[PDB]
Structure 1
């Protein structure tokens, strides 16, 4: 009644819509409440609770929530596309300044989430919204959670396999903001090459081999707790000497240093969003 649908964006199902009163363009996420597959509403209520408390220009803005028919409608700001479509539209080929702008905005949004005690836990190109003016927003807080109350464990079933860090692949019970910084590193590698996933494993074993094959297998010195993790098993010792130059050809030495700080296997050694924003990659004086 309040909104006219213009077209389906994808799948809840998402629609481009117009406010019937104001005529502003928005994105509507419709969530069915008369569950066929029980559970969907639960994730939508968590997303609403978190986005109510996360108002930042680099986090998708929830304007309103409507309850009509047997459905919940989440009213979001409208964005032109996601990073997946953006890669398809430019042959996966980004200008180095767009690489830098997109990572900068992702880190600002992520930095804001972490400072508010929220883990995103689902960073991937489909969840990064892109506007024609070059704005980037972090979207989809369906797997996000508040942290701070000490607990036995979180779920180890978080992040799609290709964006999941080695501590979580080894079945770590607890993780910090470090989980999202690994995913941010994976996305940086996509921006800085041809928009293809850096570590496209078929399963947990293949995922760990692809990571260690590029970065080197962490030593007992680098990661003393590694061998004690619940699903630890011995991996081959791949050398730490393998060049990153051809894996991220859009990046100079400065960009490669920031990528290595994001892709630290030991979660305690991973750079924070706040530290990453202070990296010389983002200075006015960067080559």
Structure 2
């Protein structure tokens, strides 16, 4: 309680100051929101990287947990509103790079984010991008029977999880990263804004192609599989991402694979020709 509060930007983020540095507070009521916030604290204490939001301190007073984080000027969503209907190709490149760098770091420390979307990405005035909001994140590596399919915001949720998959790898955040890449490169609008699970799958498949049992053998065994009508794979993503070069589009298709095993990893994506 030595933080001077200011403008009120699972919890609530406030801009604040101490006496000197400006910060963001996340205040959390203690009266399963808490189990979720405890997990976020545990993970962030162990993930220090320039492309991941920094947790400075954790406070406990009057039946509240205050997590004290670094402050960034905006999230990517508000960034999209500030400039309008256009990011320079170089800014697209820079943001994807930093995203993949922070995501590559998480994955290499055995952490899945499971909620990649523009509201969870922070942007400084200096053009630094940081991953935030690890409330849905988790550590992996101990052989488990399964996780949870209740993960990722709808528009960023991959088809295997939409098909009810409870088991998944780092490839889950890679689909989400691809969806963000398309937002960056078009005009900051979601690539797949479905109304619900069914309609989401329709949108993905209409653009990419309903996957065959050839491309994705084990799909019929997923607990909420349904056989959609067999739409044209329109692999010329050119019409959806017109300000992306041939090289950018190649990487974008490799992120956006329906079969989680076909998805490029963060490490491989950074070695992609797109970047240089």
The SS at the match of 1:110 is helix
Deviations 1:47-67 (A, max 9, x none): 000000100000000011011
| 1:241, distance to aligned residue in structure 2 (A) | 3.4
| 1:149, distance to aligned residue in structure 2 (A) | 1.1
Deviations 1:105-125 (A, max 9, x none): 000000000000000000011
Counterpart of 1:270?
A: 263
Q: Structure 2: 5+ residue runs without aligned partners? A: none
| 1:92, distance to aligned residue in structure 2 (A) | 3.4
Task: Tell me the distance in 1 between the aligned counterparts of 2:223 and 2:37.
Answer: 31
Task: Tell me the distance in 1 between the aligned counterparts of 2:142 and 2:85.
Answer: 41
| 1:40, distance to aligned residue in structure 2 (A) | 1.4
1:63-82 equivalent positions in 2, closer than 5 A: 63-82=56-75
Task: Tell me the distance in 2 between the aligned counterparts of 1:18 and 1:241.
Answer: 51
Task: Tell me the distance in 1 between the aligned counterparts of 2:242 and 2:70.
Answer: 34
Task: Tell me the distance in 2 between the aligned counterparts of 1:194 and 1:69.
Answer: 44
| 1:79, distance to aligned residue in structure 2 (A) | 0.1
Deviations 1:125-148 (A, max 9, x none): 100000111000000000000011
Deviations 1:15-36 (A, max 9, x none): 111113xx21111111111xxx
Cα 1:270/1:242, change in 2 over 3 Å: closer
Deviations 1:70-123 (A, max 9, x none): 111101010000001001111131100000000000000000000000000000
| 1:152, distance to aligned residue in structure 2 (A) | 1.6
Range moving further from structure 2, 215-224 or 46-55: 215-224
The SS at the match of 1:189 is helix
Q: Structure 1: 5+ residue runs without aligned partners? A: none
Counterpart of 1:17?
A: 16
| 1:242, distance to aligned residue in structure 2 (A) | 4.5
Count, aligned residues: 275
Task: Tell me the distance in 2 between the aligned counterparts of 1:85 and 1:54.
Answer: 25
Task: Tell me the distance in 2 between the aligned counterparts of 1:27 and 1:122.
Answer: 20
Give the TM-score of the pair, scaled to structure 1.
Answer: 0.94
Deviations 1:140-164 (A, max 9, x none): 0000000111112111010011000
2:114 to 121, 132, 139: 121
Task: Tell me the distance in 2 between the aligned counterparts of 1:18 and 1:107.
Answer: 31
Give the TM-score of the pair, scaled to structure 2.
Answer: 0.98
Range moving further from structure 2, 51-60 or 222-231: 222-231
The SS at the match of 1:158 is coil
- Structure 1 runs of 4+ aligned residues shifted over 6 Å read none
Task: Tell me the distance in 2 between the aligned counterparts of 1:44 and 1:226.
Answer: 34
Task: Tell me the distance in 2 between the aligned counterparts of 1:92 and 1:273.
Answer: 27
